Symmetry: C3
């Protein structure tokens, strides 16, 4: 009767108004409320205890309402909650329960997706405090946490950290901590305007799978000297990665502390992304302390087709150990990336490198087990003034890394600082197809292009090929006497080297070793016997006991004689060859030779 | 009057309740039903004949209801049907009509997209039977089938095959058979828990275009010995591909039968994906029998930037013929992939390879027309115990394949089994920039690193470069007498070769051919005349009629004389050079030479 | 009372019918209209002035209705307007206001996304006229335009240009002109059936950021001889790109005028896409005239992992200047692409090339500043008949370009037409790892594989390596006398060269320069003195004053003597070496040597 009017204006009203899709007689006879129940938004929970809707804004703490939404949808097996466009939804307090320990604001739950179309902002309650905006753990102790599965965050919206600085270096801040996370992702979202430790973390100590970050943007997420460290996406579960993202920082501190991506477990990737203003591109590291979920090996690591302007190192390789676990890194590919060091003074940020073999956190360089790394088809450029730029800074033990078909245009090709660490190196392979650029030509006074400041080098190949002159460099490659060298191949192509005083330098005459295979140019003075006809020439110096053959790199300006085209040696360390005196007489010549040993 | 109450509670109720968007006076005056009619879900068709909604579950066959939805939406020009989250929708019977012949469950229709947010499960009715869950053909005979256009399946949902094994090897099972499919795709879906032939097939015998699989997951889709074969996504129309997917198998049988992707037509790709537990990565094959829609050539084939742990072959190249059509494969690129053979006993699965040139289905090796393949910037690794691992197993005729700047770390570089097929090889190019790894060092007793077990080799380049010692190997490269060799270049760099008895071996002295260009190290015994002064040395053996020049790779321990630095030959097959006797006397020496022919 | 009935049938009806999500007592007590207000479609504005809905179709101009939708949603802070599936929405007039100057139809507005599920078609009103379907400028003068931010167009729908030809060459036509566009994108849309200048343009004269085109299709967008030019996506703001798109043309005119992508600002990319039927793949060019928003440098340019069949040039590099600005292009990577020239007569379209260094629009070749380009791991193929095919056509000044590990199979490796431009070349690097294919073998009568038709060449490397014979070619590499050559390395590997009359040719004897490093094969006639024993041989010609060493590439058919293995030279330009007469007598021989200078 008039009871009907009352029902209709009541909350159950829509449950009494019939609907059948497109008047189709074969369709289900439903009620309007049933169709509206097919979707869900924050508006459906953003109300006071009387059920009246509350408008969001800077004086409203939306946290409890969003939590209620997620908890309720979780209760029905999942779904997608929309965070509506055209509004900014402020968060103003910590969550409670299991996420309390993680300084969590919102607890994510399995199968409950968030479609963020509007903006989520942190209120000043969080200034100078830690926070983790979305947390997937359900326990304060991550080891007793259940899992988070099938949770996807996506949309055109924004998460804005409100510009608040850290209160103390020891604090952590995150956007999305997925936890022990399986089939979770973040797509399309802009994370901005903060001072945080990470924007997103996938996995927890190897527990997790199939977590991805795609088409997101990360903008100005470090802003203070208080911030101890930053990796925008931290990939800590296997079969997981970052694809087609954009990362930008503009603070000075970001140039010293910030890394775009950290890959910490097997079968992870970082691809198709653009970085600007960061210290570092990617960490690729097996931390023993994070090896509980997916084992002790980081393998199948891929960094590909990225574009970066950074201030420190592009890719940092590592592994370490704990009292009970030893970490290992292997089967890595770095390819297709175009990377430059941004304009900066020499030494004004961490040492510029395409690849860095870094020591562990405690600075130890003798714990690493890094091998089967392929670095291929990349471009790297540093401005000419940046003394501290290298294709590779090899500062810790290396068990293998292979470079093929790259283009490196920076100050050093291989570098480690002297005095410092003395890395044990095996299976360092520098193929002849690496092109060494000319930007730093004339800047290398006192310096060695490949500065082999290592404890030892074995089973390695360095094939140096210049593509322009740099007569400022001390040598193309130098081994100090402290570096053992064995079962290696070291060659310097003669092109652009004719005027170099030193090409390859072995300060402990390591090139004499039984299984060292070398070649490089040198200038040699020779004197002949006086005999007319076929006549020997002999080097005046006796430094060539290790030489198997040598050949001329100089023309013969003489008519009446010619020096030998090719030389061998003698037991006293002289070179000897057979030339020709048309007319007799003692000859004396200075010739550029290619010295060869076992090659 | 009270007629109004009745209208409102009726199915037409919502068609009588007015709505205007946001009270905007300029907006359309509509009825609620009009706005609800903008979307459509399974709920709108999942009802009994009285229009009452039916709850899904393991005792409800949702098939007819989903079919009705698709048929109805098809009738209005298309749209997107949501399969709601928070529910599992069981399928319990075969479809009828044109898809009956394809063992179809559901018939897809043009412009009707499915947004799968919940789960679709197969009921036990399908145990031991064939099925194809979604079928795009409209006729039992595919040749008389109409097309499927603009059909997209996407969402966060799941298709679960219920774990049922095949009933017989001859049965086929599929998830999505798109048919003659144009502008169709599958995005975001998890396919799991089955024993099937394929998860998705795109195209039919070259008919189709612009079909894609992106961000899907494929998990445990082979589970029995009954399963004859499996390719997770079968790409059988052009301008189509797979991108950023995840594939995983855990059964033993998958290691022997399962391939992640099959590319069978032109302008197809497979990229950015991760594979674990499969026998094979990708087939790239032009089957003559499937050449009706897009011609007889598979060209523009791309496999790039994938990550794989497999048990057999990463990329399998092929082509075959029928009585009226000859298949051809050309213009292929395989690049950026990092691939390893998983831990397994030698010979316990199909022979491990990065690239396999396979014979056709009937085993024929003389029908293939494969050329212009570029294999570049890949990494490959097999554990040291896996005897049956090769960069390339070349088991059928090859008309060209080019390898540049890869890193191969496995047992063989080039291999084919002896006795077996005798492939005719042209335009095999192995650039010097391929890095040969050391994992298998010391495992190669009795074996040849490049084992050229072919009928003939022409217009080919093998430039061998070691980066560590392996003195266990019989030779770096060996050609049996049965292999003709012409118009080729074969070189073995001397590095790490000084102690090798055999470097390159030509069992029929094929290196003597007019247009063979070779170089490799050998040890040679020489004896000099007694003359004081310039004095010839001559090899004691007469095996060097083919040598154009040789040079020393050994130092000269003597003071009183030196052997020649360089040698040529004589008509009787001796080497001859001019050295120097400071003091006269017959000299006799054993020297490591680099033997050179026309290089 | 009966007033209630009236309210309910009124437009405010739904605002009086209560709803609470899933009967959840903790949910907001809302009205149906509130839930319907969460989404918005064209239907909500596609009405007459009385509020009655209008059906779209070929006689209805939907433009004003769509504009009203966008303007209204803009007014509320944004949202997403759906263009419904199952309908075609015709556009039939120009927009008004700021977009009038841009021949705009619809004005886009910030934060207002369009989800296009149905089809948008142009009505014949636009035949022979300019148009820009969606425009993001808000002023006729782009320089006084505000920005467009956070505008995304996406869905499964279509934009169809109605097949109308241009009315005049000077007209412009576009699909989406985003304007000064920040965080804008287009995803999933099919653009088809037109004669336009561009489908999408991102940015305006460097103003914009983070604009992307992904998973779109572009089909048959040039159709007349009237069309002056076409670039399907024009990327004119930084941090922007195209990914995973499909481009196809079928008209003849497209083969001559159409380019798939133009990258015109820094930190832009083009990846994962497939092209067929176009003249050109991508422009990578810094236009001085478009350098207002993001500076004068195009750097971090990436073209990767694309598949193309084109008729002209794959990647075109450029830079130019204006009276006040000089453009610069640097830090470019082209990698992983597989590209072929489609079947066509020689010279029937613009000259086929993988890379083209093009002159500016006015044809000037002396304004360019292009450097630090890496071209690596690509494949290129042209059919044997296409005389006009080159790895690189270098037609303008070049300051650096590096080629590593590619596979080029076309007519020329390096080419520029003689007579024409005389490019100044620096830092051209052609690594030995580039594989030169054999398709054009026997087609090269009168031609030079590397035809160095330049003003000068400095700091360059050309390492030629053949992998099959082509005895038709005039030379492997030729420098005309007009080309200066200095501080370079030029080498021709001897493999497959034994029968070549000319290998490297220096028409002005440029190989004699102080800092030229060269090697190549030649045939040389020698004569010996009659002396028994060690005996000199001397070349009969005096053309070898520049030779530092030479070595034999021929066997010695003689028993009674041997020519020298190795040679040096003399001041008169003869070669000289020491061989051996077992028996005395004057010897005369023709030998294939490897001539070497400073290498
Ligand atoms: Na040491
Ligand atoms: Na044979
Ligand atoms: Na000149």
């Amino acid at each position: 009767p008039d009871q009907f009017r009352a029902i209709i204006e009541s909350p159950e009203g829509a449950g009494h108004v019939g609907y059948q899709y497109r008047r189709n007689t074969g369709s289900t006879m439903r009620m309007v409320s049933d169709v509206l129940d097919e979707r869900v938004s924050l508006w459906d929970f953003h109300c006071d205890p009387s059920g009246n809707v509350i408008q969001p804004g800077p004086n409203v703490d939306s946290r409890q309402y969003l939590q209620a939404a997620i908890d309720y949808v979780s209760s029905n097996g999942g779904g997608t909650i929309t965070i509506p466009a055209g509004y900014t939804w402020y968060l103003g307090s910590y969550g409670v329960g299991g996420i309390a320990g993680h300084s969590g604001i919102i607890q994510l739950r399995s199968n409950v997706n968030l479609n963020i179309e509007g903006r989520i902002h942190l209120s000043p309650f969080f200034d100078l405090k830690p926070f983790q905006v979305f947390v997937g753990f359900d326990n304060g102790d991550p080891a007793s946490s259940g899992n988070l599965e099938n949770c996807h965050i996506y949309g055109h919206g924004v998460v804005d950290f409100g510009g608040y600085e850290f209160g103390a270096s020891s604090q952590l801040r995150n956007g999305v901590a997925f936890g022990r996370s399986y089939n979770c992702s973040v797509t399309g979202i802009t994370f901005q305007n903060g001072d945080v430790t990470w924007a997103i973390t996938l996995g927890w100590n190897g527990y997790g799978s199939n977590c991805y970050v795609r088409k997101c943007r990360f903008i100005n997420l470090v802003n203070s000297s208080v911030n101890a460290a930053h990796s925008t996406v931290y990939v800590n579960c296997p079969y997981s990665g970052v694809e087609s993202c954009y990362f930008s920082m503009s603070s000075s501190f970001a140039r010293n502390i910030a890394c775009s991506v950290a890959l910490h477990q097997h079968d992870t990737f970082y691809r198709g992304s653009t970085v600007n203003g960061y210290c570092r591109g990617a960490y690729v590291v097996m931390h023993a302390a994070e090896a509980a979920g997916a084992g002790s090996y980081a393998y199948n690591m891929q960094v590909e087709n990225n574009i970066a302007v950074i201030y420190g190192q592009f890719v940092i390789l590592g592994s370490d150990v704990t009292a009970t676990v030893s970490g290992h890194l292997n089967d890595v590919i770095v390819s297709g990336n175009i990377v430059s060091i941004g304009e900066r003074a020499a030494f004004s940020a961490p040492f510029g490198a395409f690849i860095d073999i870094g020591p562990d956190n405690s600075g130890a360089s003798n714990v690493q087990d890094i091998q089967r790394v392929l670095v291929t088809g990349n471009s790297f450029y540093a401005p000419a003034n940046i003394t501290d730029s290298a294709a590779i800074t090899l500062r810790a033990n290396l068990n293998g890394c292979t470079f093929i078909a790259n283009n490196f245009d920076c100050r050093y090709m291989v570098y480690n600082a002297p005095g410092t660490t003395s890395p044990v190196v095996q299976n360092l392979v520098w193929d002849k197809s690496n092109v060494i650029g000319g930007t730093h030509a004339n800047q290398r006074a006192g310096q060695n292009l490949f500065d082999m400041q290592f404890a030892s080098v074995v089973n390695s190949t360095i094939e140096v090929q210049l593509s322009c002159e740099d007569l400022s460099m001390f040598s193309c490659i130098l081994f100090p006497a402290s570096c053992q060298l064995s079962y290696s191949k070291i060659t310097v192509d003669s092109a652009w080297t004719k005027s170099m005083s030193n090409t390859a330098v072995f300060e402990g005459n390591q090139q004499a070793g039984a299984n060292v295979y070398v070649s490089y140019p040198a200038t040699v003075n020779l004197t002949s016997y006086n005999t007319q006809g076929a006549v020997p020439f002999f080097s005046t110096d006796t430094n060539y006991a290790w030489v198997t053959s040598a050949y001329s790199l100089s023309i013969n300006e003489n008519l009446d004689f010619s020096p030998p085209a090719t030389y061998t040696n003698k037991a006293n360390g002289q070179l000897v060859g057979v030339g020709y005196n048309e007319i007799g007489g003692v000859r004396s010549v200075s010739v550029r030779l290619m010295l060869q040993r076992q090659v």
